[PDB]
Amino acid sequence: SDCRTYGFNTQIVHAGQQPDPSTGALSTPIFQTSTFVFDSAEQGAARFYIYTRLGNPTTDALEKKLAVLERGEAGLATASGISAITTTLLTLCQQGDHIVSASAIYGCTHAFLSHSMPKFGINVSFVDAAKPEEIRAAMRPETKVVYIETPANPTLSLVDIETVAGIAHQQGALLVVDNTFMSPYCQQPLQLGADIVVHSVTKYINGHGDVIGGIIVGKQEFIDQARFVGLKDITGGCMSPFNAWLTLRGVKTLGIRMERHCENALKIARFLEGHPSITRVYYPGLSSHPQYELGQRQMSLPGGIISFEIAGGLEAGRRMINSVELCLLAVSLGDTETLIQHPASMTHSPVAPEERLKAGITDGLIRLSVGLEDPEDIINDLEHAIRKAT
Amino acid sequence: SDCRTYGFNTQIVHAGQQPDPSTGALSTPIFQTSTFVFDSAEQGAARFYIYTRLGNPTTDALEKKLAVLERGEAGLATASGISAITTTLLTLCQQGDHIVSASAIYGCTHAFLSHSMPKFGINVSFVDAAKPEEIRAAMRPETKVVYIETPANPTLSLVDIETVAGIAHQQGALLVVDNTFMSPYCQQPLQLGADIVVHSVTKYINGHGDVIGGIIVGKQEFIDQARFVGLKDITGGCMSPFNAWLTLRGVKTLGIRMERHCENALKIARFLEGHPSITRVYYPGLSSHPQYELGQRQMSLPGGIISFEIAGGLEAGRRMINSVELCLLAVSLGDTETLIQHPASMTHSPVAPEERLKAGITDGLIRLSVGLEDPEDIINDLEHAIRKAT
Amino acid sequence: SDCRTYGFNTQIVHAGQQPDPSTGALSTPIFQTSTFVFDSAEQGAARFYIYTRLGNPTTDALEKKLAVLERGEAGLATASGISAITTTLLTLCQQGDHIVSASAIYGCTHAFLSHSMPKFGINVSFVDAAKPEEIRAAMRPETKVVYIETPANPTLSLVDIETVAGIAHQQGALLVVDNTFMSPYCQQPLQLGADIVVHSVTKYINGHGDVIGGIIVGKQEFIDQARFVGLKDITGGCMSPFNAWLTLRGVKTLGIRMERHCENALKIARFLEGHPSITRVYYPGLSSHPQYELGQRQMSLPGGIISFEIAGGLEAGRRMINSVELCLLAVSLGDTETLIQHPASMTHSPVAPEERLKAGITDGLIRLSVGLEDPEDIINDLEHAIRKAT
Amino acid sequence: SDCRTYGFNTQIVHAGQQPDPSTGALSTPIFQTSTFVFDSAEQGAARFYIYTRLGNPTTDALEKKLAVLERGEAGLATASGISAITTTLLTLCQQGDHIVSASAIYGCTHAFLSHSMPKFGINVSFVDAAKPEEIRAAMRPETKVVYIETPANPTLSLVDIETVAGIAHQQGALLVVDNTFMSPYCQQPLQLGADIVVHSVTKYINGHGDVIGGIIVGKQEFIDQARFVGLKDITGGCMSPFNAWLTLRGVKTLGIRMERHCENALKIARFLEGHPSITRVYYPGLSSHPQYELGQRQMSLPGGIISFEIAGGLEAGRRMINSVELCLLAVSLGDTETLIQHPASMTHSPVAPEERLKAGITDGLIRLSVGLEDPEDIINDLEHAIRKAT
């Protein structure tokens, strides 16, 4: 049979994997090796597995699974989400090329695009990707890539993938989408015209807060270049077989995890929207979200991340996060535990307040990654902390 | 006490490591986490461990140990040896800069320098680094780095680190040395004036054929840039904590392994030099090596790698590797098992024979990574195969 | 706060665990050590962690979590489910003691009780535990333990835990319940009067088909004896820290997994009950189950295991399992993949047919462990295979 | 070829292992699975791998390697050294049987034999096994097993394996030898007439202080019973595949480790014997050892463990261990780090002083497990601490 014909939950469990033919072992073995042996001089030349830096059976299973889930031809695992992004863009671009990027992107990605790319002669124009006309207006004869993230932090704004793909393609560029926030269970950019999808598997795909890693999915021709040039000759961004095996294990529960994350998040978002100490709640599942209908067409679920603004600015946000007893203070997302952060007092404390404001980070903004706990316990913890903070 | 005051074997065992203060666990715990939690808003801002992509306690132990062993200030672990090299060079260089590199370098490194760097506007001049005058003559006002490997494949030629460091420094450049072949047990480039040392830990440092990884050692100021810019904003070349833990475990036996590798290799090299079917033997421990005295000053042991040429060219080399029963056919080195390869029929089969010849790869050249088996068994296997092949 | 006060899903995620105080690492570190160090002679005497055979911080987290989930005082992890059972019974019993056991128990447990115990002078009487009067009638002055499993293979019959606990206690014996089939998410024997619960974590608790292990939960006084005598001085049945860490990771999703297993199983059970080629379907969620109302009081969900009888006996059962394309042929249960077996042709093939019949294993009986795939795909596979087999 | 024909170092590296046929992976894959799948009903019956509790390809490699190294037919891996011992003895013995055991045995083994065995109707007579006549005099018609350890703590006394084997066999009993202290590199009890060898792999065989585990080696007929009855139906003492893989990795360096341990230990023993503050030194490599010549015939090296008595009794021993700066205070042995303990103040502090004295534990006795550090550093640390303590 062919895994690409089964339902999505069946694919989550089985795609890319099968019992070991030699032993019958059901779990994918951990091929924690650096060296592969040849039977003869002739077999060594013909292969020219050889070396985990080229490929590995455990990692291959993960790559094939994620390719099935994103409806792409091929996958390539990497050492980190950032390595997935930079291996992709450094494979595609050289000195003199140009990229149009969303401004509302992950912080580390922004640093790569704003400082590292221009030092290699690759220029980047940042635009508001919620306005597809700004993408069009920034495209140049040298533009190779349009780069977007959706939903995007810190207010969970959206980008219309299908519309942007059509613009990029008419002007001769590829569209790369960072799909980390959604996972393939909730959004499928390649089905909407994107050429390449990248993820930090560190978040939902692994889901267990114990793996740093990335994945790239796209056409075989591109993935072959990302592997044999990008990984081999540029970043050296290999995923270890053990991390691939842990990610395979974590992704087995992706469907049931995303369903529970999103069911919990919708309940919490509605609680916050009814709370008179909370000025704003940013969540694609609330009908007041400015791009609500686009989200309903593009995403199968509204996600597990919420942002919200607490009354009273910086000191209220600090008092709030210092008053939670169950939510844990951390900067990651997509884990089984609920995580909370207050950027203005945590990650962006040395940034000038007016510079945070232009970046959409108000003094009272809190970001919540909703976990698998009972939502009543999460709501009770938030209610306890909000009441204290105000 | 201070680990930097003890003998080298003591440092191999103990440097960078101590019993866990919280539990007393002797083994370094495997901190297989992506997320680190803060106790309050204030602690989260002060730290701005946070995230394994920034650092991790297991990986920190490995970095500190290797810094002690190379007599450097700081270490930085990476996803692969190639990532150690490219994270280093992409941190140091930008569009318009220049590198002088040895020509006799690892194949993948050559591909990065010959094809990837120039596409980022970084030019590279390749020279014969056994001739320090060629390094001097190639240096330009824009030269930021001189890059060398010693010993170098395929004939185990050497580079005079101290002399080259003095030339590089007089002309305002840094010297980067790939010390993979030797390990810090046998050669210490920083003590001879190199600025930065890189290794593929995939070889001797781990030693067990089950980890792909790299390490960078140098001054704190540079390592901080390689970590917070190179890894964070360019390659995303993180080492996983489990790979760091395996490398810590493998390096515990580095001293006893290198002693046995080199004792075995010297016996095998002398056997091959006495064999009338073997035209040449390349090994720094043989007094006929063209740079023998330099090797005796620069290396504490002559290493575990041998190359040799079998009579009868391509078909004899193929028959030989097809006739071994104990040596395993593979392209890695530094494992506990003896590994053998015949480049002209394996890795370089589609390369034009006259192009292999200019690269020092003759049709009869065999490379041997000597393992920890009884040398009598290795010699008997080689003798059996050589006699058949001729 | 106290984890014992939160909801059950919150407890699944958080109980027994917290961020590492020394580093903030969110994931429980893998303390893969054999040795623990003391700061002084005095600290070494006071502790007399010391040695993973006594205890280990990773394994302690798992033990504490499972104790919370079963509402018991303490937990003890073991090398296998069988070791959990034998460490328990060999701690409790000595030469001259007696056990009353259900006859419908796991095969390996039956072998221990029928052959191993009597060779140590410990006698066992087997009874039909669906009939509590048979338990009472078999109790002797020497009876130390009543041992039950519920639901029990092969027809998923039940045992009334509360009623049996009252009988055992009136006659001075302890009740031990193997709760593997249900997990603490679906049944809590200690809340119904059982004294000790054992599990094979190999099944649902880990859930990922990659760990062999057991756990014991009960009063602190008993668990201390099971640890310091049973494990230390009898079975030497330690769980490795890595297996404990994997089980901690697997149990994070126990609630969402059990919900999906049981939702899928109920759909499949109803499909089979409507199928004219299927003579019988054994599933606690079907109202025709002989102990249906007891199951509704004692179990929060009817479970993920189904047994059923296909028309046409031995050859139909063999043709059926040889015709599935998605279900995998295996003898375990509780994995994320759907597993199927036909005992009469697989595990019990050399047993006399009339001896299988008395054991409740008819020639046409199939056992199904329902996984996390789309139930429509599982049903389509079963329908395809049943139609072929008949 | 056949691994049993090669030299011992070659066997250490290669025995039981080969490149994976399906992939060529050189490292033995980690088959971290609980479940094995069958291709058809017929293959499932024929096998009746099936289940890691029966066997596993990773663990099988370790078992085969250790069988080669001990010159035995078959091996069986276990959860701990204690499980290797109890699985062996509980397989061999039943109610009414008798064991003659050395008195100078590992503490936990003594507890099993003195308290657990008699509660199962199995009687044990303890004798001074340095006097083979005491073994003979204690044998009864019911004696099934003679059990010995050599060298034996706390004074490293010896037992003449060959002489004791002949006595046991003439009287119809099996000889079981715990060979943990020596490893197969230094002593081979089966070659001297022992029937079964057990080890705690926790010590030298793994060697890296990060695995708890055991191994049993003997005839195929016995090992089959220890596996299919002892492990399956009594102790449930399975080794996890990951622990087996780590032990395979650790044992690769067994030969070079034992050579360095013993070279270091002999230097340290001679230093201590020349020290006027040290009243006695117990080490088989010193010619004053009471069984020196027996040790030279039976052991290829004198081992890595030393015991010694410091002048000044209990308080001097406590001051000494509180004054070391490099040696670590711990109760294990066979690790790469040097470990030290003072039983009278650490492990035996609540034992009556006259009861320790009869057990050979004087108030001033120190036990040292010599590691792989520079021996000059170990000697300097001991000298520093001894001078302070006196």
Ligand SMILES: *Cc1c(COP(=O)(O)O)cnc(C)c1O
């Ligand atoms: C966390 C994240 C990344 C970075 O991935 P890493 O695995 O941390 O390198 C990139 N994009 C998004 C949207 C992320 O959330």
Ligand SMILES: *Cc1c(COP(=O)(O)O)cnc(C)c1O
């Ligand atoms: C193997 C090797 C490398 C590459 O290291 P990887 O870990 O394979 O990326 C670089 N330099 C030398 C000298 C090597 O032998």
Ligand SMILES: *Cc1c(COP(=O)(O)O)cnc(C)c1O
């Ligand atoms: C599988 C099972 C066991 C045995 O557990 P192991 O981990 O295989 O030793 C015991 N009881 C039940 C109900 C089981 O399903």
Ligand SMILES: *Cc1c(COP(=O)(O)O)cnc(C)c1O
């Ligand atoms: C440590 C030891 C044991 C016990 O082994 P574990 O792996 O700790 O269960 C048994 N015998 C000897 C000689 C030992 O040193």
